[PDB]
Amino acid sequence: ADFDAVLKCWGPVEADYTTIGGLVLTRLFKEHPETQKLFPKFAGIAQADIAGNAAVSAHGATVLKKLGELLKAKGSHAAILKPLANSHATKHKIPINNFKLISEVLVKVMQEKAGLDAGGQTALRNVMGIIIADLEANYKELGFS
Ligand code: HEM
C-alpha cells in the first residue's frame, strides 16, 4: 500500500524528471555538502552554480527514473536493486548513510512540488527504508558494512 501511496503523487515527478531531479541534487548538495564530493564530475562546483547546471539535472533525472521504475515494481525489485547496490558500493564507493540523506531530500521535494501529504510522507519514508535496507544487505554481501 505504501508504494501505491507514493505513486499517487508521482505524476509531477515523472512529468519533469530533469527539473525535479535537479531540485533534488541541488538541495542534497546544499544541505549535505559532503555528498557533492562523492560525485567527482560535480565536486567543486560552486553551490550557486548547481541549480542552473544541466548536467546535474540530467543525472538527477537518471536517479528519479530509476526510483520510478523501483516503484512501478512495488517491492519485487531484486533485478533492479542488486545492480544498483553493486555499482554504488564497488564503482561509486557511496557509504550507505548517503541514501538516507537523498531520501530525506526527496520527501521534502515531493511535499513541496508533488502534493505528497502527511500520510504520503510516511509512506515514502517507509518505501525508502525498504530500498535502503536492501541496498545495505547487498552491500554486506559484497563486504561493505
Ligand atoms: C535511491 C537513490 C539512488 C538511485 C536510485 C541512484 C541511481 C543511480 C543510477 C541509475 C546511476 C547510473 C547507473 C549506475 O552507475 O549505477 C547512478 C550513478 C551514480 N550515483 Fe546514484 N543513485 C542513488 C543515490 C546515490 C547517492 C546517495 C549518491 C551519492 C551521495 C550516488 C552517487 C552516484 C554516482 C557518483 C554515480 C555515477 C555518476 C556518473 O559517473 O555519471 N547515488 N545512480
Short mmCIF file of C-alpha atoms and ligand atoms in Angstrom, two decimals:
data_model
loop_
_atom_site.label_atom_id
_atom_site.label_comp_id
_atom_site.label_asym_id
_atom_site.label_seq_id
_atom_site.Cartn_x
_atom_site.Cartn_y
_atom_site.Cartn_z
CA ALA A 1 0.00 0.00 0.00
CA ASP A 2 2.83 2.45 0.74
CA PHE A 3 4.09 2.06 -2.83
CA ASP A 4 0.63 2.96 -4.13
CA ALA A 5 0.51 5.98 -1.81
CA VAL A 6 3.76 7.31 -3.30
CA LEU A 7 2.68 6.53 -6.88
CA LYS A 8 -0.49 8.58 -6.40
CA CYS A 9 1.83 11.61 -6.24
CA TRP A 10 4.49 10.56 -8.74
CA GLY A 11 2.85 12.36 -11.69
CA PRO A 12 4.56 15.75 -11.08
CA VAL A 13 7.91 14.00 -10.64
CA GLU A 14 7.68 11.90 -13.92
CA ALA A 15 6.27 14.95 -15.70
CA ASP A 16 9.64 16.69 -15.40
CA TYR A 17 12.39 14.40 -14.24
CA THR A 18 15.01 16.97 -15.27
CA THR A 19 13.61 19.86 -13.24
CA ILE A 20 12.72 17.74 -10.22
CA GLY A 21 15.98 15.78 -10.50
CA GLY A 22 17.96 18.99 -10.49
CA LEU A 23 15.98 20.27 -7.46
CA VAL A 24 16.78 17.05 -5.54
CA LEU A 25 20.52 17.09 -6.27
CA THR A 26 20.85 20.85 -5.76
CA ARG A 27 19.19 20.52 -2.35
CA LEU A 28 21.26 17.45 -1.47
CA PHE A 29 24.50 19.26 -2.24
CA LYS A 30 23.40 22.45 -0.43
CA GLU A 31 22.21 20.69 2.73
CA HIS A 32 24.79 17.89 2.77
CA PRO A 33 27.90 19.31 1.08
CA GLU A 34 29.98 16.18 1.75
CA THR A 35 27.71 14.29 -0.66
CA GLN A 36 28.86 16.52 -3.57
CA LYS A 37 32.35 15.32 -3.12
CA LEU A 38 31.12 11.74 -3.83
CA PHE A 39 30.33 12.81 -7.43
CA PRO A 40 33.77 13.55 -8.95
CA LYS A 41 32.09 15.06 -12.02
CA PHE A 42 30.30 17.62 -9.81
CA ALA A 43 32.64 18.01 -6.79
CA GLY A 44 33.98 21.55 -6.51
CA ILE A 45 31.19 23.25 -8.50
CA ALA A 46 30.25 26.41 -6.56
CA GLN A 47 26.90 25.93 -4.87
CA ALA A 48 25.38 28.96 -6.57
CA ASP A 49 26.11 27.33 -9.97
CA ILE A 50 24.41 23.97 -9.30
CA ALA A 51 20.71 24.85 -9.77
CA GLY A 52 21.31 26.00 -13.33
CA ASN A 53 23.60 23.14 -14.27
CA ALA A 54 22.09 20.96 -17.00
CA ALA A 55 24.44 18.01 -16.32
CA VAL A 56 23.45 17.93 -12.64
CA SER A 57 19.78 17.99 -13.60
CA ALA A 58 20.33 15.22 -16.19
CA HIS A 59 21.91 12.99 -13.55
CA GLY A 60 19.05 13.78 -11.16
CA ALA A 61 16.66 12.63 -13.91
CA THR A 62 18.57 9.34 -14.18
CA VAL A 63 18.19 8.83 -10.41
CA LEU A 64 14.47 9.63 -10.34
CA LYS A 65 13.75 7.47 -13.43
CA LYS A 66 15.39 4.52 -11.69
CA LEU A 67 13.42 5.23 -8.50
CA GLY A 68 10.22 5.39 -10.58
CA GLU A 69 10.98 2.09 -12.37
CA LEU A 70 11.63 0.70 -8.26
CA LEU A 71 8.07 1.89 -7.55
CA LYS A 72 6.25 0.66 -10.50
CA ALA A 73 7.69 -2.64 -9.16
CA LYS A 74 6.01 -2.39 -5.63
CA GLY A 75 8.58 -4.41 -3.71
CA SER A 76 9.61 -7.13 -6.09
CA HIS A 77 12.64 -5.43 -7.21
CA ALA A 78 15.76 -7.58 -6.96
CA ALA A 79 16.78 -7.42 -10.72
CA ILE A 80 16.71 -3.60 -10.43
CA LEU A 81 18.13 -3.15 -6.80
CA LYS A 82 21.05 -5.66 -6.79
CA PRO A 83 22.84 -3.96 -9.75
CA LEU A 84 22.35 -0.58 -8.08
CA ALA A 85 23.94 -1.86 -4.83
CA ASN A 86 26.78 -3.39 -6.84
CA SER A 87 27.64 -0.19 -8.71
CA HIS A 88 27.19 2.12 -5.73
CA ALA A 89 29.35 0.03 -3.40
CA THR A 90 32.06 -1.04 -5.87
CA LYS A 91 32.22 1.66 -8.59
CA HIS A 92 30.94 4.85 -6.98
CA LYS A 93 32.01 3.95 -3.41
CA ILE A 94 28.98 5.54 -1.71
CA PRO A 95 28.59 4.96 2.06
CA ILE A 96 25.15 3.71 2.86
CA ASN A 97 24.07 6.69 5.06
CA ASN A 98 24.04 8.92 1.95
CA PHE A 99 20.94 7.09 0.67
CA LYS A 100 19.09 8.22 3.83
CA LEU A 101 20.14 11.82 3.08
CA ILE A 102 18.83 11.82 -0.50
CA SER A 103 15.63 10.11 0.66
CA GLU A 104 15.01 12.97 3.24
CA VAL A 105 15.54 15.49 0.43
CA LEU A 106 13.08 13.65 -1.83
CA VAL A 107 10.38 13.60 0.84
CA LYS A 108 10.67 17.40 1.21
CA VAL A 109 10.72 17.97 -2.57
CA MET A 110 7.61 15.81 -3.03
CA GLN A 111 5.84 17.58 -0.15
CA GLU A 112 6.64 20.94 -1.80
CA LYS A 113 6.23 20.04 -5.53
CA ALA A 114 4.13 16.87 -5.81
CA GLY A 115 1.30 17.17 -3.37
CA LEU A 116 2.60 14.48 -1.03
CA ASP A 117 0.59 14.81 2.21
CA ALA A 118 1.44 13.71 5.74
CA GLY A 119 0.45 10.11 5.18
CA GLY A 120 2.25 10.09 1.85
CA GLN A 121 5.43 11.40 3.51
CA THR A 122 5.31 8.49 5.94
CA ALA A 123 4.63 6.07 3.05
CA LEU A 124 7.65 7.39 1.14
CA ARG A 125 9.90 7.10 4.23
CA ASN A 126 8.70 3.51 4.60
CA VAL A 127 9.39 2.69 0.92
CA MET A 128 12.80 4.35 1.01
CA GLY A 129 13.56 2.40 4.18
CA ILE A 130 12.80 -0.84 2.34
CA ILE A 131 15.04 0.19 -0.53
CA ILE A 132 17.89 1.32 1.72
CA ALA A 133 17.75 -1.84 3.84
CA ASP A 134 18.00 -3.94 0.69
CA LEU A 135 20.94 -1.86 -0.56
CA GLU A 136 22.59 -2.34 2.83
CA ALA A 137 22.04 -6.10 2.81
CA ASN A 138 23.58 -6.25 -0.71
CA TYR A 139 26.50 -4.07 0.42
CA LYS A 140 27.13 -6.59 3.23
CA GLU A 141 27.16 -9.46 0.72
CA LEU A 142 29.92 -7.56 -1.14
CA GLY A 143 31.96 -6.97 2.03
CA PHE A 144 30.83 -3.37 2.76
CA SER A 145 29.31 -2.91 6.43
C1 HEM B 1 17.96 5.52 -4.09
C2 HEM B 1 18.78 6.62 -4.60
C3 HEM B 1 19.65 6.48 -5.76
C4 HEM B 1 19.34 5.94 -7.00
C5 HEM B 1 18.06 5.42 -7.50
C6 HEM B 1 20.51 6.13 -7.80
C7 HEM B 1 20.60 5.75 -9.14
C8 HEM B 1 21.72 5.89 -9.94
C9 HEM B 1 21.79 5.43 -11.31
C10 HEM B 1 20.63 4.80 -12.05
C11 HEM B 1 23.03 5.68 -11.75
C12 HEM B 1 23.61 5.31 -13.09
C13 HEM B 1 23.93 3.80 -13.19
C14 HEM B 1 24.92 3.33 -12.11
O1 HEM B 1 26.03 3.90 -12.13
O2 HEM B 1 24.63 2.61 -11.21
C15 HEM B 1 23.75 6.29 -10.64
C16 HEM B 1 25.04 6.75 -10.70
C17 HEM B 1 25.76 7.39 -9.67
N1 HEM B 1 25.26 7.56 -8.38
FE1 HEM B 1 23.44 7.06 -7.71
N2 HEM B 1 21.53 6.69 -7.09
C18 HEM B 1 21.02 6.95 -5.84
C19 HEM B 1 21.70 7.56 -4.81
C20 HEM B 1 23.02 7.99 -4.83
C21 HEM B 1 23.68 8.72 -3.76
C22 HEM B 1 23.03 8.97 -2.45
C23 HEM B 1 24.95 9.03 -4.20
C24 HEM B 1 25.96 9.82 -3.52
C25 HEM B 1 25.74 10.60 -2.49
C26 HEM B 1 25.06 8.49 -5.53
C27 HEM B 1 26.18 8.62 -6.36
C28 HEM B 1 26.26 8.19 -7.68
C29 HEM B 1 27.42 8.45 -8.55
C30 HEM B 1 28.68 9.12 -8.14
C31 HEM B 1 27.08 7.93 -9.78
C32 HEM B 1 27.90 8.00 -11.03
C33 HEM B 1 27.62 9.26 -11.82
C34 HEM B 1 28.41 9.32 -13.14
O3 HEM B 1 29.61 8.97 -13.14
O4 HEM B 1 27.84 9.79 -14.16
N3 HEM B 1 23.88 7.87 -5.91
N4 HEM B 1 22.93 6.39 -9.56
#
